[PDB]
Design a protein around this ligand. Sequence first.
Ligand SMILES: Nc1ncnc2c1ncn2[C@@H]1O[C@H](COP(=O)(O)OP(=O)(O)CP(=O)(O)O)[C@@H](O)[C@H]1O
Ligand SMILES: [Mg+2]
Lengths: 377, 390, 268
Amino acid sequence: ETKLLLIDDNLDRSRDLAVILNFLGEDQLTCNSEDWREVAAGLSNSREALCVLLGSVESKGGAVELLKQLASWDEYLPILLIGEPAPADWPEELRRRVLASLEMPPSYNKLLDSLHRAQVYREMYDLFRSLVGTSRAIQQVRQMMQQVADTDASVLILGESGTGKEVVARNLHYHSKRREGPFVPVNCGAIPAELLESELFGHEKGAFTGAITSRAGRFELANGGTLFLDEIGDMPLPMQVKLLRVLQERTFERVGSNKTQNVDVRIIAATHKNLEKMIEDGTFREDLYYRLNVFPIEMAPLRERVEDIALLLNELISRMEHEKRGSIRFNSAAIMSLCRHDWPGNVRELANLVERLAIMHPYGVIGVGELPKKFRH
Amino acid sequence: ETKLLLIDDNLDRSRDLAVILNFLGEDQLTCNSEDWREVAAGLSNSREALCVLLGSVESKGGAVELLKQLASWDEYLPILLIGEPAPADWPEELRRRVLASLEMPPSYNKLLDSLHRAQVYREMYDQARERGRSREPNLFRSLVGTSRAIQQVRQMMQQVADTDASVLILGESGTGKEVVARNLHYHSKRREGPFVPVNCGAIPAELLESELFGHEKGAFTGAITSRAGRFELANGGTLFLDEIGDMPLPMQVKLLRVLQERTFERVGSNKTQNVDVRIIAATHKNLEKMIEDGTFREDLYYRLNVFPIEMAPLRERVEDIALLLNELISRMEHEKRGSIRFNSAAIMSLCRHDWPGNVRELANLVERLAIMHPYGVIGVGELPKKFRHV
Amino acid sequence: MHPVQVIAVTGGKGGVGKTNVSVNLALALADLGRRVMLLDAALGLANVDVLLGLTPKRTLADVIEGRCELRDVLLLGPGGVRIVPAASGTQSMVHLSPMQHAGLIQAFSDISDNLDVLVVDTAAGIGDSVVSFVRAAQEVLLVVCDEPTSITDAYALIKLLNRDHGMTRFRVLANMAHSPQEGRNLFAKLTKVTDRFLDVALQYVGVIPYDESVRKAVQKQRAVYEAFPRSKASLAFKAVAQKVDSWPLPANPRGHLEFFVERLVQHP
Ligand SMILES: Nc1ncnc2c1ncn2[C@@H]1O[C@H](COP(=O)(O)OP(=O)(O)CP(=O)(O)O)[C@@H](O)[C@H]1O
Ligand SMILES: [Mg+2]
């Protein structure tokens, strides 16, 4: 991904570090004081250079001038000395870039602590449109989604009620290899306990006192796509066991049938309950928990991302332009009043409020008194 | 104090391996295929020779004579191949004395894992002086550590490996009892027999009878077939009972009957069947406290606790976390699923964690970090908030 | 291939004209040019066939009892509307388990010709069958009359659905109103109660006037839309149907059981 530059005119120590980084799984390009410009020209940009390992230099002028044209090359490129003691007379202007002074032979600990410090300074120095906002939490969520969307792993979305978990799941599905497949949502808190097994697995012509036809379950509906199990915490324990068995074996059977079918699906589960406490109280299975918790994404409440409300309002109004139930605009005082609200059931209440005022007063403007109740104070 | 021996006739490979081991801070005596004895005599005795790293041989004779001479030097000296797959030219009983084959250049995690494997080999097979039978390595795969608890577990497994007796594994949920059961099964007289794992908590309480013992035609509403139980599938093998503590009392009486009388009954059947199985029971509940609570059978408890294995929580063997990370990351490299590297701060922060669900938590965290930060350095900042500590 | 719009006609209060609204809305939507199927969710007591003058040979009792499948009980009703008939006082249809309602709703997926209209005529009350058929429908149309009992029953149904199932969007249609101001005032009262206690979205659809042509049509056992196509009630039904055709089609499946989840999954 990112290359390393070692600048050393001492060939013995240069080979020493070269084999060490090669062993340590770090990509580097061997350079000397006179041909490093050609190597730099071979670099795609200044960003691809994580750091430079400076060693003995025999070019005219010395190490002091050598840091000058690397400084002219980039001011944000960090420097660490290899096999040279910490300076005591070099100019002070360059001592905000000497991260550490390593000695040959280097040690494993301080090499990675040096490499970690280099990554921190580089980070300090320098497309999910559905999820809008500017808080730290929202961009952390976006980064985690970017990291997990390209791989086949079980995602668990943790948060509170009405925090926007289905949107995150859909963005994960759309930016994956399964984009052309189906998206099948399953709500375990909107299906009775006796119906969940038949709904997920399907049934034959006769399996129980109500089965009148043979139909495909939602695992077979999700074949070639992702299955989004919302409210996994209220799933009954026997159904938890059967779901674990299906996930482990990759095979399932319809209710009232003995034929085994295989389905390749991606599991994205959602929860608002504290699962760990549920395993502690024995109301949830720990094995299913660790099968579903390969990658957890924690969503943040709207009361903790208050500066984001206006953008959410504009986004919600935006989507009503596509689903054709009208439009409405807001006032600055009304927006400030909404920002000063507790908001339990964050995005669900925000969308409910917008829909309610859109149907109530269409193509209007909302003031402080225009809000219905308990939203201005 | 312990030393290695690098024996390879390629000068460059010897030199760069030597400098790698100096970088890791590992003592070594560089050697060749002609003068190793002369420098090997400087060390006190054959015990300080942890292992030998043997590469390519382009000297007189084959590798067989060098292997025999090394075995003469000390019979208990593990061998690590560097950049050379093992050749298929020895008997299957004589093809297993080396521990690992390290691809060139070796990976940090795999190198450390192989060194710890050599240490585990040396610390028990050398000093034993008791096993007249040929040694059986590989019996400790997921058991890596330098704690008192893990060494006690290894001693108990070595005691029980050569005896066919019922085993009771005591440990918290997620400690890794299944791998211990598999290690006991595949390195006992049952190696060719089936290994059948059953989780009592998974089967519903009303179906545990049919699942464990099987049933015949029309045994219950829904019994269209005569499916046979787990015990008969484990005949000539091993059955692994996990969380035996939730199994109800009548089932406990029938299990004791299977253990002693070697007989059981199917559902809907009027005949007794004899099966020869080995029962390795696992639980995470205090069985004694259940006995004075009137929930577990006391006689069953005495029958099972003849060979107990107490697997300690990770929070009580925290100084083994580094080795466990090396094993997990090494497997993750072997399956081409990526690699991660920690600094000292992250490892210390992890060591100060309570770890509920010890090894499953560790593996889940490793997988999560592989997804989050692939090919990067993990510090305290990049760990999840629940793992950060001051 | 397209998603199918499902409309549940309800209201809790009996005798508010749920069946008349269902039948006349079905015929009007067929008049605009859609393939419409009408289901008589009044499973124990059938009134769609009575109002339309039909005498079905096979009904849904035959489907549940297993003598026939679901396709062969369809009847070609007036205006091209395909009717699913219900039983009238059959011991196997008086009360069904939730498993049976789930099976019947799921079995409707075998039908793949209707042009995104399926009108579901729920029974009176807030019972299990009514809730099951309302939750499975995309649109919920509540028929309310300007009486305290009707307002109370509609509010009770809304409160039940919102409290125990999280539903928040409801369509309200006024029936047997003697002036448009009567319908507006009825909507105002219902919204006043709901806002005082709940946080839900009520959308006014229209008003169906009190018209004796409806009574003559019921006496003749024919539909007011076809028997008296130029009456005030028929014109009101045509206007409502034009308004209903402008409703947004479903696009995404929800987690619970609902009609035609197959079309809501594969099409997107
Ligand atoms: N707008 C209107 N003008 C005149 N009569 C009307 C009317 N709407 C409904 N009615 C009358 O109401 C009576 C019942 O109608 P309908 O059978 O459709 O009600 P309903 O289905 O709600 C009763 P239930 O729910 O018990 O089946 C009939 O006499 C019908 O003609
Ligand atoms: Mg009716």
